Amino acid sequence: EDEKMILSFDKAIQYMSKRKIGALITIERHTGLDEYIETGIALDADITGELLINIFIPNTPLHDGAVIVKEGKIAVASAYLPLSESMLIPKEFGTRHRAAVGISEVSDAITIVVSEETGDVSITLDNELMAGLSQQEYLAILRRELI
Amino acid sequence: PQQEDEKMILSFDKAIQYMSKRKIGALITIERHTGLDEYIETGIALDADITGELLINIFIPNTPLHDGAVIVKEGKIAVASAYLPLSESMLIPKEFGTRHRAAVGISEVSDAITIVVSEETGDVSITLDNELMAGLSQQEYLAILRRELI
């Protein structure tokens, strides 16, 4: 039932992709994101699509940094992630994409970005940034990498 | 201690200040001795740490979470968008609003403390023991929350 979380992610992502609402969600796997989690605002909150949409409503106190998911919970919102210095990044991509890449360099975390500019959905994992994702594409990557 | 109870109050105050100034409607019910589980089961489970920032994000108008009541239970936002009973008091006009009737409603049926910000005015009210304290100062609502939550 790690699927319930994936369908909650799916609700949130569909809503924000269509409306070009920027979103940054890192999911902890084996590498502890402890030192990054303690830079954010504590939520320790149950995962629902509704909560994820509300966090990322633009011009709100929680929309800016990273949501970090750990166990079954939203641990924090507005967490600071390491920003990638990689010169291999296509530059059309913003701070959310540099956060996504930068946390993938130091961990095995899986990060979802919704572009604030285009509503383009991205997953980052193992330095690989996978932009331009459709619904069935992001749902399969997430299911594959989280069961 | 009171150190964490003072932190809860500081979270409410930040939320109240932000929404009052923007005329953002808000309803926050704080469980004390009366169980509110029958009302909590009607909402969307958050089970979240209390922060001013989360409370602001919850109540942004026309958002999934902004409607109904946040219920706080044992230092946790248990739910958003929860049902509370509407007061049917002979003392209350039709021209009172939904959140104000809910606030009066829950204070008739529980020792809960309810904060409401008027979406029409930004006026801050607290209901407690069948009593509605209307158009509160920051200093007033701080003093009421300090005396009842601590």
Residue numbers in the entry:
A (entry chain AAA): 145 to 291
B (entry chain BBB): 142 to 291
Publication text:
The enzyme CdaA, which synthesizes an essential second messenger cyclic di-AMP (c-di-AMP) in many pathogenic bacteria, has emerged as a promising candidate for the development of novel antibiotics. Additionally, c-di-AMP regulates the bacterial stringent response, further underscoring its significance.
However, suitable crystallization conditions for unliganded LmCdaA could not be identified. Therefore, structurally related CdaA enzymes from S. pneumoniae, B. subtilis and E. faecium were cloned, overexpressed in E. coli, purified, crystallized and evaluated for diffraction quality. Additionally, we report the first crystal structures of apo CdaA from E. faecium (EfCdaA) and S. pneumoniae (SpCdaA), as well as atomic resolution structures of BsCdaA.
